[PDB]
């Protein structure tokens, strides 16, 4: 049959168009601007109280409260300014792999190897935190989840699909099926109209929340993609993979822009996050260290060291004032 | 200094006390990870326990001679195992079920899975308890079938004992890390107490070794 050859010639046409639409490189344009000064951050706070490996963290939208998830079966709400514990939620299943914090501040969410996303109400008249909803429609482990408008949540799982839910009914409003391997992460766009997902097929995809369709596919990585994050503008995103490189893609050129790698580092990337202005790019590594890259010149502008095990999760506040890192050594650190 | 911050700090300290208590309670369970190649006898092994909302991971709890066991089965996961296998880095032991009755190159698949698990980078110093199941069907088949179908280099006699010993040695020779981890083999019996006794003895051995390592004597 001719369907496979039709797909092949379509791929050739697409890549030829992408080659045509390329004029210069980001390095050639950027080689005249001032290289940012060498960055030196310090450990301002150390949040301790988890007894097992930390797997995820997420900042509140007020840039003071943050939630963290650990496989000792616990979900902890931290006050970063004073290192006080606000809430400690026990979980039914201890094999948690992701957590989210609602933009309003009223709910939290978590999921894992139970294939169920649990949603907890933080503000009840009884004075305690109670589980309010359990979303169960996935056939694989939950790997990420993000709130949209306090009533809609997007989830990705290891069964190669993504889903958009309705919390009060508990039913999958939409299902996104374009990947061939496990989906490892997703990030929401600032306008919450689009989102991007990375999978173990070494590809990234751009989905439209409305119409439930896939608009664009980006390739270039050599192994599984473990992390993804939008540029603050909303026109580009960055990905980290197991082949020890980060990459920047642009939504409008449908093409890779730059590759962040160094021959002295060979381990994979667990998390990635942009700075407030998009000038810095922070990435967590298996070699127990975090690297701060210049997002425009591709030079390693700094190093965050101090964790005694793999850095699993990373976050930046909405006002750009601090960075939170969580690691398998069961400690969270605030850097400034 | 503090006006209502004192009450918040007191709340934090009570939360800390509760966390320490729950951690101490949880740390006294013995965790086992149960593995196999497509229903090799896992159902029978779980049935030998003495003492649905989820479809991702199954948890079985039992208690033998004052010792508490939690056993995790991840058969119904069927995802990429290398994305979640590191969640079990610090389990006490791995139960591995292998069916002796096989029949299209299924023993080969069991050996391949055992090779992948035993040599995993997350499971060094972790001991394997290897259960061999369905010895009676193996009796009958070896009576009316030669072992050369699976292993062509077999030379020994075509009775049961040499065949079983050869299979056990073929599995046990897949252990590259012979100087760190130990393998405890057992042919499943029909007596209820003996399987649990074997598991209990192996777990006590592993506990003693871990205590010796922690004290700095190993």
């Amino acid at each position: 049959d001719q369907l496979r050859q039709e797909a092949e010639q379509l791929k050739n046409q697409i890549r030829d168009a992408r080659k045509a639409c390329a004029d210069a490189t980001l390095s050639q344009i950027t080689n005249n601007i001032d290289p940012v000064g060498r960055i030196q951050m310090r450990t301002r706070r150390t949040l301790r109280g988890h007894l097992a490996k930390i797997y995820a963290m997420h900042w509140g939208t007020d840039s003071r409260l943050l939630v963290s998830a650990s496989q000792d079966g616990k979900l902890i709400i931290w006050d970063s300014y004073t290192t006080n514990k606000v809430h400690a939620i026990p979980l039914r299943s201890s094999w948690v792999m992701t957590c989210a914090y609602a933009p309003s501040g009223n709910y939290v969410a978590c999921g894992g190897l139970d294939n169920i996303c649990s949603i907890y109400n933080l503000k009840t008249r009884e004075g305690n935190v109670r589980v309010s909803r359990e979303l169960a429609g996935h056939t694989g482990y939950l790997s990420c989840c993000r709130f949209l408008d306090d009533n809609q949540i997007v989830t990705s799982s290891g069964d190669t699909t993504c889903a958009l839910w309705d919390i009060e009914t508990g039913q999958q409003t939409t299902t996104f099926t374009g990947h061939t391997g496990d989906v490892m992460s997703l990030s929401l766009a600032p306008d919450t109209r689009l989102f991007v997902s990375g999978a173990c097929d070494a590809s990234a995809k751009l989905w439209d929340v409305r119409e439930g369709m896939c608009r664009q596919t980006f390739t270039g990585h050599e192994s599984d993609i473990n992390a993804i994050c939008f540029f603050p503008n909303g026109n580009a995103f960055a990905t980290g993979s197991d082949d020890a490189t980060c990459r920047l893609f642009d939504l409008r050129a449908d093409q890779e822009l730059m590759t962040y790698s160094h021959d002295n580092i060979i381990c994979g990337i667990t998390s990635v996050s942009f700075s407030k202005s998009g000038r810095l790019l922070l990435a967590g590594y298996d070699d127990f260290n975090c690297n701060v890259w210049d997002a425009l010149k591709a030079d390693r502008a700094g190093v965050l060291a101090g964790h005694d095990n793999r850095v699993s999760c990373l976050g930046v506040t909405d006002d750009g004032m601090a960075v939170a890192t969580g690691s398998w050594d069961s400690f969270l650190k605030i850097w400034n | 200094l503090s006006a209502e911050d004192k009450a918040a700090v007191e709340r934090s300290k009570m939360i800390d006390r509760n966390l320490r208590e729950d951690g101490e309670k949880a740390a006294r369970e013995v965790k086992l990870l149960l593995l196999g190649a497509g229903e090799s006898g896992k159902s029978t092994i779980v049935k030998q326990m003495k003492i649905v909302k989820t479809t991702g991971i199954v948890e079985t709890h039992f208690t033998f001679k004052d010792l508490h066991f939690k056993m995790f089965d991840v058969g119904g996961q069927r995802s990429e195992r290398k994305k979640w296998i590191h969640c079990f880095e610090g389990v006490t032991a791995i139960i591995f079920c292998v069916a002796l009755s096989d029949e299209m190159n299924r023993m080969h698949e069991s050996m391949k899975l055992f090779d992948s698990i035993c040599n995993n980078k997350w499971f060094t110093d972790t001991s394997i308890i290897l259960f061999l199941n369905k010895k009676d069907l193996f009796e009958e088949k070896i009576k009316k079938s030669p072992l050369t179908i699976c292993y062509p280099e077999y030379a020994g006699s075509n009775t049961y004992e040499e065949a079983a010993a050869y299979i056990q040695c073929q599995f046990e020779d897949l252990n590259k890390r012979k100087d760190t981890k130990e393998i405890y083999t057992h042919f499943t019996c029909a007596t209820d107490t003996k399987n649990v006794q074997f598991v209990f003895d192996a777990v006590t051995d592993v506990i003693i070794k871990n205590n010796l390592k922690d004290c700095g004597l190993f």
Partner: single-chain antibody, 232 residues
Framework: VQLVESGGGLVQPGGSRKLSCSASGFAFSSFGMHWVRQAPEKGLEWVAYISSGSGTIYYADTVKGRFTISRDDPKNTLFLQMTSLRSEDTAMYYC??????????????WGQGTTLTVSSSDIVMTQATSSVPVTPGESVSISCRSSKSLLHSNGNTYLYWFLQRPGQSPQLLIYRMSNLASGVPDRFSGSGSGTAFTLTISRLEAEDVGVYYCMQHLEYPLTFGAGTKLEL
């Protein structure tokens, strides 16, 4: 959420009496508790406080020694034992719950209170006006004044506003001087600075009439200040 008090009545002076407060419908062990008394035709007076976990206890100077507060968590029962009953201890007693963490609203639910009748404070809050006739649909502004500055080094201003309708318990309206309570219409608002504060009501309805109290939560004793009646 229910708090029900019991144990009041007529007591000969010099005796001892025990009041109890039973809670049902919330996590009792996670809340600190207060006893607050109101004298007949007078304002509100803070009496005693016990924290969550029973690790901190505070008494007013006028009840120190002869009053003792305690709680029993399994039965969800707070209680107060009183000895040497003087003549100033004739009042209606209220059981109040309060929880303290970042962003919480203390003093949010008040009990019903029990009447005790016996036969025979570095911060001052000065709520100047006694009574103000009002009309529905009018904007009203109550004011409160404090001797010390209520601003703290951490940016908070610890002022609270309570409304008591005729014949009922007080209820919280505004906490920390600008935070509207839960279940309170946006008609009420609060503002101020340092030592001078105001509560503003845009439109007024028949169920807004009552006595308004300001309260400070900055320091060791909690002081209210006499209320401002708001009639029509």
């Amino acid at each position: 959420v229910q708090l029900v008090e019991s144990g009041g009545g007529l007591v000969q002076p010099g005796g001892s009496r025990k009041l109890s407060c039973s809670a049902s419908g919330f996590a009792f062990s996670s809340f600190g508790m207060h006893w607050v008394r109101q004298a007949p035709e007078k304002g509100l007076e803070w009496v005693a406080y016990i924290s969550s976990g029973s690790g901190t206890i505070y008494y007013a100077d006028t009840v120190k020694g002869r009053f003792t507060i305690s709680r029993d968590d399994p039965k969800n029962t707070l209680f107060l034992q009183m000895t040497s009953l003087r003549s100033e201890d004739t009042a209606m007693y209220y059981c109040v719950r309060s929880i303290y963490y970042y962003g919480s609203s203390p003093f949010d639910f008040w009990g019903q209170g029990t009447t005790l009748t016996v036969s025979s404070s570095d911060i001052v809050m000065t709520q100047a006006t006694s009574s103000v006739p009002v009309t529905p649909g009018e904007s009203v502004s109550i004011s409160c004044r404090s001797s010390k500055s209520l601003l703290h080094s951490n940016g908070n201003t610890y002022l609270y506003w309570f409304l008591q309708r005729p014949g009922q318990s007080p209820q919280l309206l505004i906490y920390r001087m600008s935070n509207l309570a839960s279940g309170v219409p946006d008609r009420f608002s609060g503002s101020g600075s340092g030592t001078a504060f105001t509560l503003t009501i845009s439109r007024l309805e028949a169920e807004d009439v009552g006595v308004y109290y300001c309260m400070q939560h900055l320091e060791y004793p909690l002081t209210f200040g006499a209320g401002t009646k708001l009639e029509l």
